[PDB]
Design a protein around this ligand. Structure first.
Ligand code: FC4
Ligand code: ZN
Length: 261
């Protein structure tokens, strides 16, 4: 990706991606709007199994598009199973998409409603051996999406907020061990699920999306810090990292299933 020039600006944003990544106009692109009245309850959907007790976080990185908290995925330490999934999916990293204003920022929307931000916990199907192989498969990834609304602070998110000062610009990283991702989950695991894609280039259609119905609340101060990050690298003109979200894409020939009535 040494030649990738896509971003979220007026000249390289979502409306431009299809030129370098034609799959942008594909048949199972993400995100999508979740029409709650049209999603159908699927009683055959098993409860989701989130096992993060042995999670091993390693580093946090500002990659110029968002910041990723990375985990050791060389063993089954933090995995997602159940729900619409068959097999074991390992957590490799999580990141967020957020806006410049509290009224926007999420990628998925619920009945057209936009949340302040959206957390993506990325997992890959272990039957494919490694993440690189997994993204080339229709069932290679499982991304657990969680909406963030502004209200009370999320205690479990503060460690992330406090380290952002050290990775302000593109390419900067910092040790980030012993972070417990369980502190970012809502109480309920009720969810909607549909087959989709990565929401940023290469936009590969390798994701089973699992979006939780219950958002978590974060404080205005917490999301404000997210907005102080930079898309640019150090020593370059400052461009605040905000509105790094892709808008809802056509649902086309897909049905969103709900795990609850
Ligand atoms: C790095 C890219 S795709 C990719 N990633 C990798 C890769 C594999 C492992 C690591 Cl540590 C880093 C990169 C390889 C390899 N090897 C590869 O061939 N392709 C990626 O993972 N982007 C990505 C992830 C989630 C989402 S989202 N918003 O849908 O959750 C969007 C884009
Ligand atoms: Zn994402």
């Amino acid at each position: 990706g040494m030649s990738h020039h896509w971003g979220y600006g007026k000249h390289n944003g979502p409306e431009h991606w299809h030129k370098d990544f034609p799959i942008a106009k594909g048949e199972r692109q993400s995100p999508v709007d979740i029409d709650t009245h049209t999603a159908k309850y699927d009683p055959s959907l098993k409860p989701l199994s989130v096992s993060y007790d042995q999670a091993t976080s390693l580093r946090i990185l500002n990659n110029g598009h968002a910041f990723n908290v990375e985990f050791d995925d060389s063993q089954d330490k933090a995995v997602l199973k159940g729900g619409p999934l068959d097999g074991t999916y390992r957590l490799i990293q999580f990141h967020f998409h957020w806006g410049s204003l509290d009224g926007q920022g999420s990628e998925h929307t619920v009945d057209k409603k936009k949340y302040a931000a959206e957390l993506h916990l990325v997992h890959w199907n272990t039957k494919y051996g490694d993440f690189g192989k997994a993204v080339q498969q229709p069932d290679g990834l499982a991304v657990l999406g969680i909406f963030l609304k502004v209200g009370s602070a999320k205690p479990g998110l503060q460690k992330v907020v406090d380290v952002l000062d050290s990775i302000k610009t593109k390419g900067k990283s910092a040790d980030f061990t012993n972070f417990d991702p369980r502190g970012l989950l809502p109480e309920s695991l009720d969810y909607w699920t549909y087959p989709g894609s990565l929401t940023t280039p290469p936009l590969l259609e390798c994701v089973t999306w699992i979006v939780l119905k219950e958002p978590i609340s974060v404080s205005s101060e917490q999301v404000l810090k997210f907005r102080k990050l930079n898309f640019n690298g150090e020593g370059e003109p400052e461009e605040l990292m905000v509105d790094n979200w892709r808008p809802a894409q056509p649902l086309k020939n897909r049905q969103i299933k709900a795990s609850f009535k």
